[PDB]
Design a protein around this ligand. Sequence first.
Ligand SMILES: [Mg+2]
Ligand SMILES: [Mg+2]
Ligand SMILES: [Mg+2]
Lengths: 245, 132, 108, 58, 75, 90
Amino acid sequence: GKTVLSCRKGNGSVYQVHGHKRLGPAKLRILDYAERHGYMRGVVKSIEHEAGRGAALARVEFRHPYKFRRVKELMVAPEGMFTGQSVFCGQKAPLAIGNVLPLGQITEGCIVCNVEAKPGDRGTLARASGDYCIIISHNHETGRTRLKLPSGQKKSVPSTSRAMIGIISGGGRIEKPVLKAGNSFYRFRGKRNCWPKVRGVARNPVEHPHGGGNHQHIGHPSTVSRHSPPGQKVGLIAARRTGRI
Amino acid sequence: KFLKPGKVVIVTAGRYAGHKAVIVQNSDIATKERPYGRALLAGIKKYPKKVVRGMSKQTIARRSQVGVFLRVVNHKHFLPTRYNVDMSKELRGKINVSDASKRSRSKRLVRHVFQARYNAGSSMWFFQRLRF
Amino acid sequence: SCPRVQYRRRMHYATRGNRMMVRTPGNKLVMQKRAKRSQGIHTPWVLGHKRLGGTKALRHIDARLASRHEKSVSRAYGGVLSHDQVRDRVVRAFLVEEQRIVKQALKE
Amino acid sequence: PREIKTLKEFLAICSRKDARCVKVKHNPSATKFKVRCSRYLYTLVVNDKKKADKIERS
Amino acid sequence: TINAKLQLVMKSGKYVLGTQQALTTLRQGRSKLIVISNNCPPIRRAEVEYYCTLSKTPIHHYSFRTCVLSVTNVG
Amino acid sequence: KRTVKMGVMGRYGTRYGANPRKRAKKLEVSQHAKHFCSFCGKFAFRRKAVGIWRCDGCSKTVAGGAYTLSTPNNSTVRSTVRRLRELAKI
RNA sequence: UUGCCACUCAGAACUGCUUACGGCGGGGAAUCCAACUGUAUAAUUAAAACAUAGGUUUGU
RNA sequence: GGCCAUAACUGAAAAGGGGCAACAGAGAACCUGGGUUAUAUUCCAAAAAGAAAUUGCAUGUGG
Ligand SMILES: [Mg+2]
Ligand SMILES: [Mg+2]
Ligand SMILES: [Mg+2]
């Protein structure tokens, strides 16, 4: 038949993140010489709200180590970080709530948000609102820290990655219920174009594998294979445990 | 005790807002033209620019001058500090009166002092620039 | 006899840019553009975004030709900073070098 | 247009080189001196017999 | 004894609190004791600290919010 | 004493069911509530945007908490920091 | 201390229609279905369908 | 041989090639009066019917 809405979405024509009222990509300051062999102080000046994100983005300025400017860094804001806090992000940095001292140098059992997997990618993990990681184990013989991602899935990363100290701002967003379709309209209008979700079982059997019939029923089991081709990999993909627990 | 004459301050909150200036005569209470603490002070409008050590010539004179103002600034517009200049609160602190026809010649002697006291090595701090 | 009016210029749209209605010495009531009165000179948005005193709100044409003392006071950081944000910047520029050179040098 | 608030500065700027014309004016309650320079017109309005004086020569 | 060391201080005379005025009492040198509330920004909670160490005045930090108190009479 | 049982949520009336209104009322009453700023001292924080709190009287913007000022796990985090600073230094 | 620049309501009698532009909800009792506002078969289908908030699941 | 002056041809640091895309965003130095069969914030000529603002280059009074 025709291509399915999910398949007809990696074309990214209309279903492409909007990001016009967004600020730049929020990420740690670039891992230069200064954040390896010392620290550098930076003042938090503005905490804005990138449209389409529950976490506050704090505009942190540092000094450019080499030219004479003041380079300006956009970072996700750990909760509690206020305007004018003098954030330190280096090697010898203190461990106050917001600093970006390296991950294998943070004490164990600590609480770290905006951790980064690879040493330099400027912050990937634990970076949505209220999310964070707990440092569990350091392996100084291997040089790799095992932190516990905000999904239970605890992984090992190198002990030279960087990480903020705290919880990402905007925690507790997901608990205030929406109460109306219109407050879901304005949530996704800063996010991408996936709303409303028409149920594939309410579609025609040309546009979706579930659609069809005189009754709205999924004809065959919803759990589809991991290996199934796109346009078929719809429903519960490689569902290993199924249904209410 | 804190604002003794000859003690250098920073002239906060004025045309000369960050300049360093020495108190030469403080006061307590005036009747109608100064309800405020009335520390007259002379200070720097023209800092002597850094000695280039290069073309040591009359340009070193044209770039090591000290321009001087005299104002009776209120005490809530200073910021006293640890230092002094010892610029003769009893010898020079009286031949620098503030009445009319004096701010013409009295100003040109506390200027005439900073001329030489910077050309000589005395403070090396009072003649820097308060960078803000 | 209540005349109506026209958008005299070639833009006939009611955008916040036009905002035009005056009586004429020929009694030919007709409406003219305004200037979009800009907000004036302000402190930085970070530092408590406030209007500066002693400064005008001149537009790109009034500002490009009027004198320089219509847009700045005679202080340091005049026309960018208010007296509040100068006087606090001079003690912090001095109480820091004071707490420094006594505490960066205590090692004999 | 400026209005010369002077008898000296006016007679200076009125006797300048531009002097496109000097339109003598008579109106109620005053007597007005329109000099037409190249870019302004400078007026000197007066309430006195000094109008007819500086009218003959200026 | 913060509220007690300051109680009879009110039984004595010329109670003065307020940042701007806790300095008018230092320039005109009549300030016996000065108290700094520990909920003050480190600018003039570091500037009035500069004056007490500049005029050998005593200092105190304890914690109509009262942010600073400079007294001239004791008790 | 208007509106005896469901308060701020009177905006909706019969709609949205009782418990979604009541779960969202707990969080709608706090984001509009002024909080305390250990800075200025007096209650001054409003909620200029989700996870963003501004204090006019303090003139400083704390970040954090979507419908309150400090999520009560930051309350534990904020201590564990100094817990793992001071005791981990002295 | 009574001077000058206000049409709104309230009441009184008076009289006279129980006949008077225009504009301007019929209401109640129930049962069924959908919670709701919403969208939607342009040119026969506006619904009980879609959406929806909510709930859960799966992958990661 | 230097008073003074234009010019040549070098070449001082300076990261991030250009370039379009808005007759409703931004920006944008002019206002009345009046004498066309039909144009005018467009035209009017010298008692510019007037009055302004403004850009470029110039001579020159002010330091
Ligand atoms: Mg099919
Ligand atoms: Mg199938
Ligand atoms: Mg503005």
